[PDB]
Amino acid sequence: MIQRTPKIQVYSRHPAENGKSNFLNCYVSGFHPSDIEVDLLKNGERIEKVEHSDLSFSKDWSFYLLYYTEFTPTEKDEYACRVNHVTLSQPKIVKWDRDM
Amino acid sequence: YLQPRTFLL
Amino acid sequence: EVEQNSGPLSVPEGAIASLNCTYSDRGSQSFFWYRQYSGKSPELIMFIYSNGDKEDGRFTAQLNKASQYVSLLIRDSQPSDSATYLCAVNRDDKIIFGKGTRLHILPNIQNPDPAVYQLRDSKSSDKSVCLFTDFDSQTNVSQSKDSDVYITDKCVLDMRSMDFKSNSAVAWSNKSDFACANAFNNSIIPEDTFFPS
Amino acid sequence: GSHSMRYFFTSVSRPGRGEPRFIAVGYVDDTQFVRFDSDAASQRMEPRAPWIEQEGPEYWDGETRKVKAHSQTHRVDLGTLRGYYNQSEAGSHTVQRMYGCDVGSDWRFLRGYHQYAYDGKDYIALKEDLRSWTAADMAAQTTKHKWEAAHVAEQLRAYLEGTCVEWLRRYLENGKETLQRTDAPKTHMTHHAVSDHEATLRCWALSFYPAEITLTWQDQTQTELVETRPAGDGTFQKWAAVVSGQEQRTCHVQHEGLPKPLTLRW
Amino acid sequence: GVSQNPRHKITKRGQNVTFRCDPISEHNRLYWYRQTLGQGPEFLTYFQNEAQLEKSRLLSDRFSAERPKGSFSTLEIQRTEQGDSAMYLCASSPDIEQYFGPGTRLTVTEDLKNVFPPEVAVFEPSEAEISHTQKATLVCLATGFYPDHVELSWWVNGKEVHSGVCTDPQPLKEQPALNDSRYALSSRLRVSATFWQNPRNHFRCQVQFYGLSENDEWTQDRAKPVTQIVSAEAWGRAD
Ligand code: NA
Ligand code: NA
Ligand code: NA
Ligand code: NA
């Protein structure tokens, strides 16, 4: 029963453009075991209309998942991804940076 | 196309 | 699952017997040849899992996954091989069997002596049976066509000490209108058949 | 180029909560095409790629029947491994299985794989020769012995070399317009200043397919590099960054969809 | 390694039957099959441990199989039809290769009055056969038995023999087109003329019949047609 902390990446499907509709992604990878909480946040409020991929693993047996939501970028709105796993003492909030 | 035979560990 | 085998096969002692089989699911992986003696259950004689030929003594199994085919060849056919041969193919984690091919290993009758004898009963001598014997392995016995007459199929006995094999068939009727000369009439018997007095 | 068909299975016991969770996913290359989640309502094998929706009710019933059987076997596996490792009926455990085949540019069999992990550690794997096993421990050797006594490698090899390759070629043909397409990366460079004496350069590779890509800073390799990530539309993304004032003295992109590898400068 | 009980069973149309299967110890997979003469085993049901995973679509609601502790298994036929008459084979497996049990031969009869044991007769060899070939054939005839579950053996001077013995693969029907027709079977034992001509030589035709049990209801004036052995004998003749 070996733990592996998830790598998290918060990013958009296409280059962000205020007003232009897009997809915000949270890609969680390299974790173990499979039990994981992932939420997408807008100004600290939980986004409900979120979808995710089916659980799969890489060559080394570590899990990966993709959580995504439809969003319209604005200059003022802040988007983030809250992640909780057995390997995290405290849940990890990863803010969306427009150039990452 | 899944393998039709399964093997017990 | 459809597994296709065939009909009765008569092969002489020492000859090559060849059984064929086809299965309907190209996805199958496990193929077997089960043998089954009369009043017994199937026993595994061979398994084949790869395209190619598998040899085990007098047995050669062949498998063609592309043409969904399985064969079994028996070299130097022996009396112990007279059984129904069942082709078995997996359908997931279960074996699905074919109908079975009955294989008869015929003895090689060196000096035929077709002869019809009347045998009387040990206790009551008012009862009797007709015994057709010592005929060739190519002689076929056509069964009870009469309501009152009963004709058994032929079968081989081996007198091991003597190195002597013999074919035999039996007939009997409850009817007093019964003679051995008119018993094996439905059967195609030779005119060199001894009919004693 | 070369293609692959892989099946990924996860089984997780839930001693308090209920029956084990079973997720099965099927991929052709970097494209998912089937899924099964024992917790979903359908209790059916589901399409996830448009080209597999062409398959008739016979394919779907058969794929369903099989996935349910894989599920049942892995349930038994969970109780077997709990037995092998003297574990209590009270803790959660995970068995993962992976199997599939690789073909070349000729669409001929290349490589086969069929391996298992338990609680995140290797347990058993079919060797490259498709004739022998690699048990990771003495518990995993009990499996090896029963699998050697039962001629499992031979039946498995018949599926990996034949059956698997045949269906992969069918999938590659039926879905040729998506599976047999190279989407070249839409590359670009971004400039951001970390300090009044230092700067950061970011080489971007976007909207590419397949996922295999190589981004290198010209060769310099001591740079921030991110794991290739899905864009969610069947394409992938990646970026490579490097940390003055003379930031004009280059990033190299190598991908299957590029005839001659592209070079970027600021 | 696989056991089945009962080996033979006779039931009256409309009764209930239960057969047991004791598979091979480390075998997680268990199957039930059905077989009739000139056919192959027909798939009925499959267990992986205690779980019944697959059941034949063509199989009736009257057939139900159980395997409680994932070990022994029982198959039960409720309100038996005459079409249920067959051999019930159980098979165990560790992976896919099957190890069959000795089967349960089930006969479904209209009435237990239709069940009869065999009458056994031994017909002594013909002088014409002795003169012509220097060989003597004793023919044994078992007639009027129902069901067809018999076992014929020859016993010479108290010793069971196989040399010079040939017995019909299957018994014949004493009225082919008939519901619960009685059966007949024949066998041959061939000895040398010099062996038959010795009167100190005892010949016995043994017929093991499978009928009703001690715990079976019997009304009829004639003796209960129980599982029994019927023999007929002869001694060699000098003249
Ligand atoms: Na499998
Ligand atoms: Na010959
Ligand atoms: Na071949
Ligand atoms: Na095909």
SS3 letters across chain E: CCEEECCEEEEECCCCEEEEEECCCCCCEEEEEEECCCCCCEEEEEEECCEEEEECCCCCCCEEEECCCCCCEEEEECCCCHHHCEEEEEEEECCCCCEECCCEEEEEECCHHHCECCEEEEECCCHHHHHHHCEEEEEEEEEEEECCCEEEEEEECCEEECCCEEECCCCEECCCCCCCCCEEEEEEEEEEHHHHCCCCCEEEEEEEECCECCCCCCCCCCCCCECEEEEEEEECCCC
Helix (H) or strand (E) holding D66: helix D57-84
Dist. CA E112–CA E131, nearest whole Å:
48
CA distance B9 to chain C (A): 15
Among A55, E3, B6, A35, which Cα is nearest to D80's?
A: B6
Dist. CA C145–CA E172, nearest whole Å:
13
Residue with tokens 């839930």: D14
Contact indicator for E141, E129 with CB cutoff of 8 Å: no
Cα separations in angstroms, C10 against C38, C133, C152, C163, E35:
16, 19, 18, 22, 24
Query: From the list D72, D152, D155, which residue is nearest E48 (CB)?
Result: D72
Residues E79 and E161 in one domain: no
Residue with tokens 């455990």: D93
Q: In 10 A of CB D173, how many CB atoms? A: 12
Question: Cα of C27 to ligand 4 centre, how many Å?
Answer: 9
Residues E131 and E26 in one domain: no
Among C165, C169, C192, C195, which Cα is nearest to C181's?
A: C195
Q: Which amino acid is at E124?
A: E
Dist. CA D209–CA D223, nearest whole Å:
24
Residues E74 and E167 in one domain: no
**Pair of tokens at residue E140:** 């044994």
Dist. CA E59–CA E55, nearest whole Å:
7
To the question of whether residue D114 is assigned a binding role by annotation, the answer is no
Report the length, in residues, of chain D: 266
Query: Is residue C143 within 8 angstroms of chain E, CB to CB?
Result: yes
Q: In 10 A of CB E89, how many CB atoms? A: 25
Dist. CA E82–CA E13, nearest whole Å:
6
Residues E4 and E94 in one domain: yes
Exposed, middle or buried, E97 (CB in 10 Å: 0-12/13-18/19+)? Answer: middle
Dist. CA C139–CA C133, nearest whole Å:
10
Question: Cα of D73 to ligand 1 centre, how many Å?
Answer: 9
Dist. CA C82–CA C79, nearest whole Å:
6
Dist. CA D88–CA B1, nearest whole Å:
36
**Pair of tokens at residue E191:** 């000895």
Strands of C3-83 (E only): list them: 3-4, 9-12, 17-23, 31-36, 43-48, 52-56, 59-64, 69-74
Query: From the list E43, E122, E188, which residue is nearest C96 (CB)?
Result: E43
Residues E139 and E183 in one domain: yes
The technique is X-ray
Query: Nearest 5°: phi and psi at D45?
Result: -85, 130
Dist. CA D173–CA D33, nearest whole Å:
14
Residue with tokens 């029982």: E74
Give SS3 for D73.
helix
Residues E115 and E103 in one domain: no
Give SS3 for D161.
helix
Dist. CA D225–CA E62, nearest whole Å:
67
First to last CA, chain D: 33
Q: How many CA atoms lie within 13 A of D161 on its CB side?
A: 16
Cα separations in angstroms, C115 against A70, C46, D194:
97, 42, 115
Q: In 10 A of CB A96, how many CB atoms? A: 23
Give SS3 for D18.
strand
Q: Which amino acid is at E210?
A: Y
Dist. CA E119–CA E121, nearest whole Å:
7
Residue with tokens 């693969």: E169
**Pair of tokens at residue D4:** 């692959």
**Burial annotation E188-211 (CB, 10 A radius, 16+ → b, else e):** bbbbbeebbbeeeeebbbbbebbb
Of all ligands present, the nearest one to the C-alpha of C69 is 3
Contact indicator for D240, D217 with CB cutoff of 8 Å: yes
Dist. CA E122–CA E205, nearest whole Å:
7
Angle of CA points C178, E165, E100, to nearest 5°: 115
Q: What subunits make at least 3 CB pairs under 8 angstroms with B?
A: C, D, E
Contacts of D58 (CB under 8 A, 6+ apart): none
- Listed by number, the residues of chain A in 7-36 with a beta carbon closer than 8 Å to a beta carbon of chain D are 7, 9, 11, 13-15, 23, 25, 27, 29-30, 32-35
How are strands ordered across the β-sheet holding E228-235? E159-161, E150-156, E202-209, E228-235
Query: Nearest 5°: phi and psi at D242?
Result: -150, 140
Query: Nearest 5°: phi and psi at C78?
Result: -115, 160
- Structural domain boundaries in chain D: 1-181, 182-262
Contact indicator for A31, A63 with CB cutoff of 8 Å: yes
Dist. CA C108–CA C120, nearest whole Å:
30
Q: Which residues pair with D232 in a beta bridge?
A: none
Among C172, C160, C158, which Cα is nearest to C116's?
A: C172
Per DSSP bridges, beta strands C101-106 and C9-12 are parallel
Contact indicator for E164, E145 with CB cutoff of 8 Å: no
Query: Nearest 5°: phi and psi at D79?
Result: -70, -30
Angle of CA points D53, D54, D59, to nearest 5°: 85
Dist. CA E105–CA E7, nearest whole Å:
6
Helix (H) or strand (E) holding D7: strand D3-14
Exposed, middle or buried, D65 (CB in 10 Å: 0-12/13-18/19+)? Answer: middle
Q: What subunits make at least 3 CB pairs under 8 angstroms with E?
A: B, C, D
Give SS3 for C111.
coil
- Say whether the C–A interface has 3 or more Cβ pairs within 8 Å: no
Maximum distance among all Cα pairs of chain D, rounded to whole angstroms: 71
Dist. CA C111–CA C134, nearest whole Å:
9
Among D193, D196, D203, which Cα is nearest to D237's?
A: D203
Radius of gyration of chain E (CA): 22
Q: Could you list the residue range(s) of the whole structural domain that residue E83 is in?
A: 1-110
Dist. CA C158–CA B9, nearest whole Å:
50
Dist. CA A97–CA A80, nearest whole Å:
9
**Burial annotation C114-151 (CB, 10 A radius, 16+ → b, else e):** bbbbbbebbeeeeebbbbbbbbebebebeebeeeebbb
Q: Which amino acid is at E207?
A: V
Handedness of CA A15, A19, A22, A27 (dihedral sign): positive
Contact indicator for C88, E43 with CB cutoff of 8 Å: no
Q: Which residues in chain B have Cβ-Cβ distances shorter than 8 Å to D116?
A: 9
Residue D3, by phi and psi: left (phi above 0), alpha (psi -120 to 50) or beta? beta
Exposed, middle or buried, A62 (CB in 10 Å: 0-12/13-18/19+)? Answer: buried
CA distance E50 to chain B (A): 15
Handedness of CA E65, E68, E73, E74 (dihedral sign): negative
- The domain tally of chain E equals 2
Give SS3 for A51.
strand
Among A4, A67, A69, A68, which Cα is nearest to A34's?
A: A4
Dist. CA D186–CA E155, nearest whole Å:
94
Helix (H) or strand (E) holding A80: strand A79-84
Q: What is the DSSP letter of D131?
A: S
Cα D44 off chain centre by: 22
Query: Nearest 5°: phi and psi at E29?
Result: -105, 135
Residue at a domain's end among E75, E91, E110: E110
Of all ligands present, the nearest one to the C-alpha of D55 is 4
Q: Which amino acid is at C90?
A: N
Among D63, D21, D85, which Cα is nearest to D167's?
A: D63
Residue C39, by phi and psi: left (phi above 0), alpha (psi -120 to 50) or beta? left
Exposed, middle or buried, D192 (CB in 10 Å: 0-12/13-18/19+)? Answer: exposed
Residues C156-162: contacts with CB under 8 Å, at least 24 apart: C156/C79, C156/C106, C156/C107, C156/E166, C157/E164, C157/E165, C157/E166, C157/E188, C157/E189, C157/E190, C158/C79, C158/C107, C158/E163, C158/E164, C159/E135, C159/E163, C159/E164, C159/E190, C160/E163, C160/E164, C161/E163, C162/E192
CA distance A2 to chain D (A): 6
Angle of CA points A53, A54, A55, to nearest 5°: 115
Q: Find the Cα–Cα–Cα–Cα dihedral A18, A23, A24, A25, rounded to 10°.
A: -150
3-state helix, strand, coil in chain B (%, to 5): 0, 0, 100
To the question of whether residue D19 is assigned a binding role by annotation, the answer is no
Residue at a domain's end among E74, E90, E110: E110
Maximum distance among all Cα pairs of chain A, rounded to whole angstroms: 46
Cα E92 off chain centre by: 22
Nearest CA in chain C to E53: C93
Cα E90 off chain centre by: 17
Q: How many CA atoms lie within 13 A of E133 on its CB side?
A: 25
* Partner-chain contact A54 D96, CB within 8 Å: no
**Burial annotation D13-49 (CB, 10 A radius, 16+ → b, else e):** beeeeeebbbbbbbbbbbbbbbbbbbeeeeeebbbbb
Dist. CA C126–CA D215, nearest whole Å:
106
